[PDB]
């Protein structure tokens, strides 16, 4: 149907815990929305490539294989899912 504010589903504490895993000490307020946007752009890039692989595959499901293959095109290969 239709979904909204799902990028807002990324929570302020989630962003702060991410920044702290990444080493940040004090976090300005404006960081959260822009990190949400950065995550968003990265996700349309990955999902576009994955869905394109699937449309080639004549398949209605986006396999983790196609996900990995999209990440490999992006140059940020991940190990552990599919093969």
């Amino acid at each position: 149907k239709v979904l909204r504010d799902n990028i807002q589903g990324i929570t302020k504490p989630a962003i702060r815990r991410l920044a702290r895993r990444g080493g940040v000490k004090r976090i300005s307020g404006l960081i959260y929305e822009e990190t949400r946007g950065v995550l968003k752009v990265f996700l349309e890039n990955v999902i576009r490539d994955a869905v394109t692989y699937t449309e080639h595959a004549k398949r209605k499901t986006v396999t983790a294989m196609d996900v990995v293959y999209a990440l490999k095109r992006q140059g940020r290969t991940l190990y552990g899912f599919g093969g």
Partner: protein, 97 residues
């Protein structure tokens, strides 16, 4: 002996790796010398990562190796960090700093 992996003495499958190079269309015909050497390279690399992962596991005191150990070894070892810098290990985490 009878099987090609044995005539070499390699653990990883010389015959299968030959089949993969032949099917991948990497060349019109792959020579017989190539797959043995390649299987040797994969053996050495997997051995290196596995030794480092087990060493990290022994520091953690856990007998099993987990992707935290796998990522910890990769990030910490400079050399293999250059080999797999672009890679992300799933559920690896980040090193202390």
């Amino acid at each position: 002996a009878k099987t090609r992996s044995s005539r070499a003495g390699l653990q990883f499958p010389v015959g299968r790796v030959h089949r993969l190079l032949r099917k991948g269309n990497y060349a019109e015909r792959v020579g017989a010398g190539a797959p043995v050497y390649l299987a040797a390279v994969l053996e050495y690399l997997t051995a290196e990562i596995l030794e480092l992962a087990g060493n990290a596991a022994r520091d953690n005191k856990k007998t099993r190796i987990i992707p935290r150990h796998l990522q910890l070894a990769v990030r910490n070892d400079e050399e293999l960090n250059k080999l797999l810098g672009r890679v992300t290990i799933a559920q690896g985490g980040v090193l202390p700093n």
